[PDB]
Amino acid sequence: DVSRLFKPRPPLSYKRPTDYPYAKRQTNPNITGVANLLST
Amino acid sequence: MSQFIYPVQQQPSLNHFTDPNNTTVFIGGLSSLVTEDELRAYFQPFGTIVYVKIPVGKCCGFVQYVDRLSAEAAIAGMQGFPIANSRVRLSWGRSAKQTALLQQAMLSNSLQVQQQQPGLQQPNYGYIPSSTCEASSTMLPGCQILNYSNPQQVIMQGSEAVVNSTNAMLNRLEQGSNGFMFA
Amino acid sequence: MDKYTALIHDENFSTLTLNVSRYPKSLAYWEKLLNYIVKASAPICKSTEPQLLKLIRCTYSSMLNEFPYLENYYIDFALLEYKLGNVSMSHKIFQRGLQAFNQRSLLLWTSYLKFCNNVISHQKQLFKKYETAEEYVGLHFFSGEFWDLYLEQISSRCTSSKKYWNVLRKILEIPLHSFSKFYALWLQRIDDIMDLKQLSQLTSKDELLKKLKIDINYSGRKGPYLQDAKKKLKKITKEMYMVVQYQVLEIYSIFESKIYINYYTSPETLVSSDEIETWIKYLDYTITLQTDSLTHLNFQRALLPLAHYDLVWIKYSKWLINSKNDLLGAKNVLLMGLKFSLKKTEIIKLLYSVICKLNEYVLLRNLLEKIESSYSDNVENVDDFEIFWDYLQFKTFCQNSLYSSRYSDSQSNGLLNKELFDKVWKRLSCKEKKSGQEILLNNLVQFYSKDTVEFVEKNIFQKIIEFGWEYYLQNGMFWNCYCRLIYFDTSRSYLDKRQYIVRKIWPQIDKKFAQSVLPSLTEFCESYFPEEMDTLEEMFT
Amino acid sequence: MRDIVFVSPQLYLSSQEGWKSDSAKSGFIPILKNDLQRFQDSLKHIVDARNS
RNA sequence: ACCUUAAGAUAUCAGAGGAAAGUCCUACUGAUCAAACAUGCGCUUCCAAUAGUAGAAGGACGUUAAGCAUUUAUCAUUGAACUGUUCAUUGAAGUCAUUGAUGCAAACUCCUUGGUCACACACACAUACGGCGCGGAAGGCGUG
């Protein structure tokens, strides 16, 4: 009766991820420069 | 108070049918044209035999095997098999001394008490029940290390037993056709 | 100096590995070597030497290939591989172990499912594994643990709570060792029902209305009516329990109480006669019950203690032949028992006959070639006579079927073809070392035609007569065979054959062999030649 | 592998050709390649008995 | 045996008074805010057949079901034939699954939930519809 009450839930099922991988996560690169706006 | 209890039961009073150590087979309905040798020939290949008797004029005999397995196989296989044109009904029985004791005890109607047949004193390792022998060994499990003499002593089975069995089979097939034995 | 090289340059490793390689079938040296190789790796972890791990894996695999029936080492190897971090190879090990038992092994199934629960984590696949396992090993007498695992998994995962009823209903009828626990579960779970509609979990509405006279949609006062339904259901459960208790108590009282050993120990073990007798009786009882799954399970369960005895292999093949009519099944069972049994003589004979029956003669020819090659093509000099005799019979059958007859009247040359006659005469040349001389002579006699008897006499009996081998010359059964060969000939007239015997054969024997040749010769004389008996006894004074 | 080779006493005593291999098959026992000569010498008397 | 501490504050602006410049305070006074508690709005939405064997909302980690349609099951080295293809060998990893996965769709079975309230079995309505029975749930707004 020591740990007969804290029976955990069954292992969580696996679902294919719908997000980007931790290696591919990034913000926007190739942020274009600010000098072109000043002219026009 | 627990809801699970071990089962308990009453004993069936040890007659010849309810004895697990009983090995003798009571053959009834013999035609009186059969003798001890022919009956032994009938009941030999199911196992080794301690004794075979046919009371004179009582139209019934007894076969005392060594193995309970042999006796059960004999009863299961030889049932209704006609010896000397008369069908035969097999059932369990008792010995000769026990038969005489029971007859005197029911003539005197005193007790009618039976005694259980002796056991083999387990554990036994050499023997394989329901096995036949007629006449080195590494004592490996596959073979049969020990066996019973054909009538009684105990002999260690060898590799030449298969040769001897075929030799005797051919001998009794040649001679038995000429007619020196009905067995 | 690394741990692996230090181990491999240790002297004890050479001695243990040599004992193992010298005595492959003892398993004491196997287990000692495995304990040593495991213990020499003090930490078992993911960072220990890859070479050492590969060595441990190969040692375990070699032992499991040598002894296929060790459940505990399958489990231990799979658990060690699980500890090493990868579970795919653990699954492969468990599946290989299950296949080694033909999927019927309670301990392996229990440990495999206990490991599987933590790992698979996919409801459909896990439950399909459970359904597959129950089909093979569910009817075991000691199958309480497997059903406990199944019930706890269902109660933990399922939320509809109908599969629990549908599985406990099946469990209620199997004669298990611990049927009482499941009956108590059933009684409590029926006792905790609280409304009429939940009785539809038990059976169908039409069935309840028609058999038990219980109406689920009964509207009104439902307290006493639900109590009536509970009483009727408990009566039905009591009758089910009566049947199951009778079955289980009979089985335990007769058979299961006498069996003490249920585990495969080693090829060097001996099993007791009482246990053999009770195993045979129990197998017969199971066959009589006529349940195919239960019979297969009981045979595979009986193979564990007495695998190396071959009587259970023979009995299993006989059952598959004459009760299920499955000759391919019998061939497979005997072919598998060929690996295990230590006698192999009766199994080889029965396998020969079965393969002849299935009209598969190419496999028969291949088996004959293999058994001849196993003795370096010198099977004619084998110490054990039975293997040679069976091989000679079936090789003669194949030779007759393959080569056209070289004698008249389509009298097929059985043992008179130069391929087999060479072997027969080579065995006859030993003359005291072997055991089947008389059997070979007597089985060579039977030909019964003019040219065939002429050939047999001239090649075997005349040649031995001229060589004068004392062992055969003083053995009266040889003279009986010669006289019987001549006398049963269908070509000679009676006067010709009597003349031939009396004036040729008998004078050819020496008088100093009288005290040994007289019994069999007189036995033949009394049976066939009562008139010539006077001549015999006069000449043999 | 390294410093370990598989030998099969049954196939060796049956005078066949594939008694030694580097693949882990059924009926194969590991052995040290340095010590294969002593493995052969251990079975010498039994193989001579079979030959005679 | 190890441990003994972040520091501040508790609606807000404006006006009158008391202890040049802040500084503090006022069971002081206005206005705003926030909280609690009462209390209302012709406020807004929702509250299940019995005149019947139903239905609504949400589930199923339920069955049919191997449903109907698609699609997947290693890499390196060496030898051989071959016009890329096939067979074998050594090494390296390797979630289980293929009765799976994914796409589509339907039937069935079952669980939880609710005023299963009262009066009615009714000819209404253009300003379109007495929102003119008692409660309950949830919000919106107003007053004290």
Curated annotation (Swiss-Prot), chain A:
The positions making up the signal sequence are none
Q: What subcellular compartments does it reside in?
A: Nucleus
The function of this protein is:
Involved in nuclear mRNA splicing.
The note filed under miscellaneous reads:
Present with 736 molecules/cell in log phase SD medium.
Quaternary organization: Component of the spliceosome, where it is associated with snRNP U1. Binds stem loop I of U1 snRNA. Interacts with mRNA.
Name under which the protein is recorded:
U1 small nuclear ribonucleoprotein 70 kDa homolog
Which residues of the complete protein appear here? 11 to 50 of 300
Curated annotation (Swiss-Prot), chain B:
Knockout consequences: Affects the meiotic recombination and the formation of viable spores.
- Transmembrane intervals: none
Q: Which UniProt keywords apply?
A: mRNA processing, mRNA splicing, Repeat, RNA-binding, Spliceosome
- Residue ranges of the RRM domain? 23-95
Q: Any idea which GO molecular function terms this record carries? A: mRNA binding
According to its UniProt entry, one GO biological process term is:
mRNA splicing, via spliceosome
Any one annotated GO CC term: commitment complex
Keyword Ubl conjugation attached: no
Q: What's the subunit arrangement here? A: Component of the U1 small nuclear ribonucleoprotein complex (U1 snRNP).
Any further remark recorded for this protein: Present with 1480 molecules/cell in log phase SD medium.
Tell me the domain comment: The RNA binding domains RRM2 and RRM3 are required for NAM8 meiotic function. Within the U1 snRNP complex, the RRM2 domain of NAM8 is positioned to bind to the intronic region immediately down-stream of nucleotide +13.
Q: What does this protein do?
A: Component of the U1 small nuclear ribonucleoprotein complex (U1 snRNP) involved in the initiation of meiotic recombination. Involved in the formation of DSBs at recombination hot-spots through meiosis-specific splicing of REC107 pre-mRNA. Collaborates with MER1 to promote splicing of essential meiotic mRNAs REC10, AMA1, MER3, HFM1, SPO22 and PCH2. NAM8 interacts with the pre-mRNA downstream of the 5' splice site, in a region of non-conserved sequence and is required for efficient splicing of uncapped RNA precursor.
Q: What is this protein called?
A: Protein NAM8
Upper lineage is: Eukaryota, Fungi, Dikarya, Ascomycota, Saccharomycotina
Curated annotation (Swiss-Prot), chain C:
Q: Which segment of this protein is annotated as the motif Nuclear localization signal?
A: 230-235
Single Gene Ontology BP term?
A: mRNA 5'-splice site recognition
Major localization class: nucleus
Q: Supply the alphabetized keyword list.
A: mRNA processing, mRNA splicing, Nucleus, Repeat, Ribonucleoprotein, RNA-binding, Spliceosome
Record's keyword annotation contains Transport? no
InterPro entries membership: HAT, TPR-like_helical_dom_sf
- Keyword match RNA-binding: yes
Q: Where are the HAT repeats?
A: 7-39, 51-83, 85-118, 121-156, 163-195, 255-288, 290-322, 366-397, 456-488
What GO terms fall under cellular component here? commitment complex; nucleus; spliceosomal complex; U1 snRNP; U2-type prespliceosome
Any one Gene Ontology molecular-function term assigned to this protein's record: RNA binding
Subcellular locations according to the entry? Nucleus
Further comment found in the protein's record: Present with 1730 molecules/cell in log phase SD medium.
Q: What does this protein do?
A: Essential component of the U1 snRNP particle, which recognizes and binds the 5'-splice site of pre-mRNA. Together with other non-snRNP factors, U1 snRNP forms the spliceosomal commitment complex, that targets pre-mRNA to the splicing pathway. U1 snRNP is cotranscriptionally recruited to intron-containing genes. Required for U1 snRNP biogenesis.
Q: How does it assemble?
A: Component of the 18S U1 snRNP particle, a subcomplex of the spliceosome.
Which PANTHER family does the UniProt record give? PRE-MRNA PROCESSING PROTEIN PRP39-RELATED, U1 SMALL NUCLEAR RIBONUCLEOPROTEIN COMPONENT PRP42
Name of the protein described by the UniProt record: U1 small nuclear ribonucleoprotein component PRP42
The record lists the lineage as:
Eukaryota, Fungi, Dikarya, Ascomycota, Saccharomycotina
Curated annotation (Swiss-Prot), chain D:
The subunit field of the Swiss-Prot or TrEMBL record says: Component of the 18S U1 snRNP particle, a subcomplex of the spliceosome.
Localization (cell): Cytoplasm; Nucleus
Q: What family does the database annotate?
A: Belongs to the SNU71 family.
| Name of the molecule in the record | U1 small nuclear ribonucleoprotein component SNU71
Its biological purpose:
Component of the U1 snRNP particle, which recognizes and binds the 5'-splice site of pre-mRNA. Together with other non-snRNP factors, U1 snRNP forms the spliceosomal commitment complex, that targets pre-mRNA to the splicing pathway.
User: Which species does this protein come from?
Assistant: Saccharomyces cerevisiae (strain ATCC 204508 / S288c) (Baker's yeast)
**Note in the entry:** Present with 782 molecules/cell in log phase SD medium.
